[PDB]
């Protein structure tokens, strides 16, 4: 517990204070460190015998340097470190639009960890989850950030010389906002999650978005602007007939950019809309517009360098103002995929380097409810930072353990509910953590994707492994406690529905009674404990808003487990001659991975995991 | 009761209807005659009864029984205005009417004077080689549909399947396999021009041709996104109407192949009531089908007449589709159904309409009981046969054992006292129920001063009717429990807020420890009653969605409890949920002297968060 005795020369007050905060994370030994800015390297550290000289190029890179220093002094007296970062900016973007809105205090902790890793930039992805004046439905009951909360988060990042970029939506993905049945909202709509191009009240809204953002210091923004298939085909088509869609996209983009210009923003956007550059009057419009933005090539999936290169080459044929968006996999349920994230980071990094890409944005999406922990992907983030600054992973685990207290190997065990043994490591989205959990009991529609001889022992062993890590994870224990309880549930739940069917089919009524009176009530108890663990996780990381969806989904699961109990009981009492749910033969849930030598699949929509019945449709 | 002139078929039909009706000790001579739809004459124990159509005997018997309780001398002649009067039950919104219930419903329709029974089936019938079609939905086997049609045939009632040949196939197309995804344009719409789609449609008519009936409703409504999805990516921009014509033509040829005559909604032919190559294609096909003009909403005959005349121009082989309101949650709206039927009947007569179809939709989960609308069914029978409602209540009591006004108390969870009778879809039964506790986004539409008494009085009334309801008691018990819940749940959210704002910590404690645990107990009871109601009328499939929705609401009440407890223990400065000011849920009824509204999607009642979106 002894406080650090470290001594520094050449720091500003801002820097000394920043360092005091980071002593909460890293353990600085009793040495003397001379610090100066220098253009010579991103980071240089030299010295021995308690006397060290530390240079950084950019103010924020001091914080990574210190992580490096602590790490190297653990095993060595003499230090010979020089790092040259491949990327002028390295960013992490947190999804705050899928129900999980990262709370102010967790944003500050993430900024501290990102400063230790080497990121220059912090980003938050907000569709409807920022307050806009005069638009009371925009973010309503969503925990939308106030301008003050956004300023506060930015300002904290500024304490570490880290920049903030809001990622917003200026055309589509505004579904939580446009659902509201008041004229002031409905008149802004084209169809689904898409706003109505050409409508002045739409640009009044978009102006409002920028008015809010211009209260920040930052003048950089991601405006989204991906190509939605339905754009121009809803109430737009009804009012204005058929137009050229890329011409429509251009028309809208130009309006957005002019508004951005008025408030002094530079805009980044997904490159999709310009894929055709890689009808001449439209080609010209597009070409003029691509010159006013930074294009972002996003890819979270490819298992080799050359697949990325092919794309980068195509892009450079039209723009040098290019950033790459990789992915920290945390959008497939309760459990991340840091392993897959590693695999693809390695290849993407090579390609970014070959194509001298200047900027990398690591994305943390939270698809379909935000149920994966915000801090579950710290390893993926350290990975990218290592790849940037060192171009290898030789120091990954040690730097990670300096920063978090856990080896990267232990932390990455967080992924276990997805790591079924027969999966090859290079296919994405295979998410048993989720679909085993929310699957019905009586009507187990994912049951053909289960392999209980392998899955049962995997999940059970994962629960023990995660319990052990939890005990040494300190302030990250909550992450592993949640995952240990999930895996424990999955070890039984993975085949309970099949075991019911087997018992029903062979008329083993003793087994059905055991299942209905012991196993299922205990399964409910386990899921209620998990719900409590989950809520503790959520409330620590996020605002309360959005947790309500999870309460709804897990409440329903519990109620369906009770239904299995009651239905079995009726049948045991000889009231029912048959249980009709059990007379339905189970088909494959999807053929997406039908060709492969494993039964697992991808299933990432709660409402289709839970029931074959209608639930959202009229 | 002694009869003469009946077939064996007819004497057995009557033995079945003796289960619903109490024939007196009299002699009745029965014969067919074109003189009247129904005629009854006689006195002092001997009567002569005649029917035009065999099925009209069963209504005649309901009339016979009724009048003889009043008087000795009977003088009845009825001229049915409609050549066919049909009831269509929705079997696609999760609730699939079980066979035993189809049989009870058939029996009752026969007593009422209906000629035709229809089941609305999107994906809820089995198709050979199409295992995802109705998978885990309780889709009828061919055996089941034949059994149902065969039971109707016993009462000389015909059967008409109502299916979908273009759109409204959401529960089928969602399945993520090539053999289903290859059939999709977009959303709930099939891909026009795709042979594998015509192979599916052929299978639909393959299944249906196992029936005796050769009359079908094929749907063919005009969905906005038709030709705009994967059709557009494959074939580029094309005329919407032409597209529909090409599909309709393919569908009709498949029908012709199986010997079926098709009805369909008239919507695609509104424009022709256009490019010339298109007005030709249209005009042809208009003559090959019966058109169905659907309207469940209008409160004046002239509004219906306007539409009828427009329709009469185009190609007047036209049927009308009215509405027995049972698609707005847990609770029907027979009252509103009567208001519109009265005017719809006038419009149908004024325009010489041959056939009326009463539709019983189940929007967004089928949570309203199948037998909840018997009053509206009788209303249409009485309006077809007598053109008035003087005999409504008495014929209804004969058929069911309850007066029509007693039965119609089933509507009470929707009948808030400040509502005008002619605005539709106002459904506090459902949204007061499913609303969150901490985040009550429909709260500006509650009026605890009138609503709390209304619902509370309703639970008593309905408890009283339950006790004299016989085989329909389950309906009223369900609704009694619902109303009892609503009388406190209508403002528990607001009372939590007021207490919170006023630092009334003892109240919040009673709410969190007493009221809300009791509320959950009541909701669990309701769930049980509902589940009994459901499993009595429907197949088990589709119940699971209700389990889910109700499971979620109970977990959300446990959240209100726990959040309040954390606050009471000092471990929170504020309850952030309660710091959000509640806006109007919708402005649909903003300009009115009442606070209630329409909100009929579960997922948007229950949470402002995302729940189905990615």
Please give the structural blueprint.
The structure is a homodimer.
Chain A: E1 7-9, H1 13-22, E2 32-37, E3 43-48, E4 51-56, H2 61-75, E5 79-83, E6 89-95, H3 104-117, E7 121-125, H4 147-159, E8 163-167, H5 175-178, H6 183-186, E9 189-191, E10 194-195, H7 200-213, E11 220-222, H8 235-240, H9 245-263, E12 266-270, H10 280-290, E13 293-298, H11 305-316, E14 322-327, H12 338-354, E15 359-364, H13 378-389, H14 396-404, H15 408-412, H16 432-438, H17 452-472, H18 477-505, H19 509-541, H20 547-572, H21 606-610
Parallel strand pairs in A: 1-2, 2-4, 6-7, 6-15, 7-8, 11-12, 12-13, 13-14, 14-15
Antiparallel strand pairs in A: 3-4, 3-5, 9-10
Domain Glycoside Hydrolase 20C C-terminal (chain B): 405-591
Protein name (chain B): N-acetyl-beta-D-glucosaminidase
Domain N-acetyl-beta-D-glucosaminidase N-terminal (chain B): 3-78
Describe the structure.
The structure is a homodimer. The first copy, chain A, has 618 residues and is α/β, with parallel strands linked by helices. The first copy, chain A, folds into three domains: 1-84, Double Stranded RNA Binding Domain (2-Layer Sandwich), CATH 3.30.160.230; 85-393, Glycosidases (TIM Barrel, Alpha-Beta Barrel); 394-618, Four Helix Bundle (Hemerythrin (Met), subunit A). Chain A is 46% helix and 12% strand. Chain A contains 21 helices and 15 strands. The first copy, chain A, has helices at 13-22, 61-75, 104-117, 147-159, 175-178, 183-186, 200-213, 235-240, 245-263, 280-290, 305-316, 338-354, 378-389, 396-404, 408-412, 432-438, 452-472, 477-505, 509-541, 547-572, 606-610, and strands spanning 7-9, 32-37, 43-48, 51-56, 79-83, 89-95, 121-125, 163-167, 189-191, 194-195, 220-222, 266-270, 293-298, 322-327, 359-364. An eight-stranded parallel sheet of chain A has the order 8-7-6-15-14-13-12-11, with helices on one face. A five-stranded mixed sheet of chain A has the order 1-2-4-3-5, with helices on one face. A two-stranded antiparallel sheet of chain A has the order 9-10. In chain A, helix 11 links the parallel strand 13 (293-298) and strand 14 (322-327). The longest helix of chain A has 33 residues, at 509-541. Chain A is globular. At the A-B interface, helix 20 and helix 21 of A face helix 21 and helix 22 of B. Chain B: Residues 3-78 form the N-acetyl-beta-D-glucosaminidase N-terminal domain. Chain B: InterPro entries: GcnA_N, GH, Glyco_H_20C_C, HEXDC-like. Chain B: GO terms for molecular function: hexosaminidase activity. Chain B: Pfam families: GcnA_N, Glyco_H_20C_C. Chain B: Residues 405-591 form the Glycoside Hydrolase 20C C-terminal domain.
């Amino acid at each position: 517990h002894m406080a650090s005795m470290v001594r520094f020369t050449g720091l500003s007050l801002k820097q000394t204070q920043a360092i005091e905060v980071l002593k909460g994370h890293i353990s600085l030994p009793d040495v003397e460190v001379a610090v100066t800015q220098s253009d010579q390297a991103s980071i240089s550290i030299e010295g021995e015998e308690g006397h060290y000289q530390l240079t950084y190029r950019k103010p924020h890179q001091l914080y990574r340097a210190l992580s490096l220093l602590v790490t190297v002094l653990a095993e060595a007296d003499k230090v010979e470190i020089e790092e040259q970062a491949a990327y002028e900016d390295l960013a992490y973007m947190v999804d705050c639009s899928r129900n999980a809105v990262l709370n102010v205090a967790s944003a500050k902790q993430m900024i501290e960890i990102l400063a230790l890793m080497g990121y220059s930039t912090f980003e938050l992805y907000m569709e409807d989850t920022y307050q806009i004046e005069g638009q009371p439905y925009f973010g309503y009951f969503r925990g939308a950030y106030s301008a003050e909360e956004l300023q506060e988060i930015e300002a904290y990042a500024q304490q570490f010389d880290v920049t903030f970029v809001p990622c917003i939506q200026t055309l589509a993905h505004l579904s939580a906002f446009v659902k509201w049945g008041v004229k002031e909202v409905q008149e802004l709509r084209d169809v689904e999650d898409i706003l109505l191009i050409g409508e002045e009240k739409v640009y009044d809204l978009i102006d409002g978005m920028f008015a809010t953002l211009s209260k920040l210091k930052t003048r950089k923004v991601n405006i989204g602007m991906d190509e939605a298939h339905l754009v121009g085909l809803g109430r737009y088509l009804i009012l204005n007939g058929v137009v050229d869609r890329s011409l429509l996209m251009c028309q809208h983009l130009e309006r957005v950019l002019d508004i951005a210009d008025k408030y002094g923003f530079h805009c980044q956007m997904w490159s999709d809309m310009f894929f055709k550059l890689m009808p001449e009057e439209t080609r010209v419009y597009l070409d003029r517009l691509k010159d006013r933005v930074t294009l972002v090539y996003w890819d979270y999936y490819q298992d080799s360098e050359e697949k990325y290169n092919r794309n980068f080459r195509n892009h450079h044929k039209i723009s040098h103002d290019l950033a790459f968006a990789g992915g920290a996999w945390k959008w497939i349920g309760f459990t991340p995929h840091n392993h897959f994230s590693r695999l693809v980071a390695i290849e993407a990094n090579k390609a970014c380097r070959a194509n001298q890409i200047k900027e990398v944005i690591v994305t943390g999406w939270g698809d379909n409810g935000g149920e994966t922990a915000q801090f579950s992907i710290l390893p993926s983030l350290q990975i990218w930072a290592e790849l940037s600054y060192r171009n290898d992973l030789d120091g990954l685990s040690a730097h990670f353990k300096t920063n978090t207290g856990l080896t990267v190997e232990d932390f990455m065990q967080i992924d276990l509910a997805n790591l079924l043994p027969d999966l090859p490591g290079n296919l994405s989205g295979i998410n048993p953590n989720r679909y085993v959990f929310y699957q019905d009991i009586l009507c187990p529609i994912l049951d053909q994707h289960m392999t209980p001889e392998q899955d049962k022992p995997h999940f059970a062993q994962a629960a023990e492994t995660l319990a052990n890590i939890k005990e040494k994870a300190g302030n990250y224990a909550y992450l592993f406690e949640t995952q240990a309880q999930l895996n424990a549930i999955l070890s039984s739940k993975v085949d309970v529905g099949r075991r019911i069917r087997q018992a029903y089919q062979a008329d083993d009524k003793e087994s059905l009674q055991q299942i209905a009176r012991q196993e299922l009530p205990e399964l409910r108890s386990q899921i209620e404990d998990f719900h409590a663990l989950f809520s503790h996780q959520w409330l620590k990381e996020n605002k309360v808003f959005g947790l309500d969806t999870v309460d709804i989904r897990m409440g329903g699961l519990l109620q369906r487990i009770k239904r299995a109990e009651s239905r079995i009981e009726v049948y045991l009492a000889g009231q029912l001659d048959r249980i009709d749910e059990l007379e339905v033969e189970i088909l494959p849930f999807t053929d997406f991975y039908a060709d492969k030598d494993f039964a697992a699949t991808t299933a990432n929509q709660w409402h289709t995991i839970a029931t074959a019945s209608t639930i959202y449709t009229t």
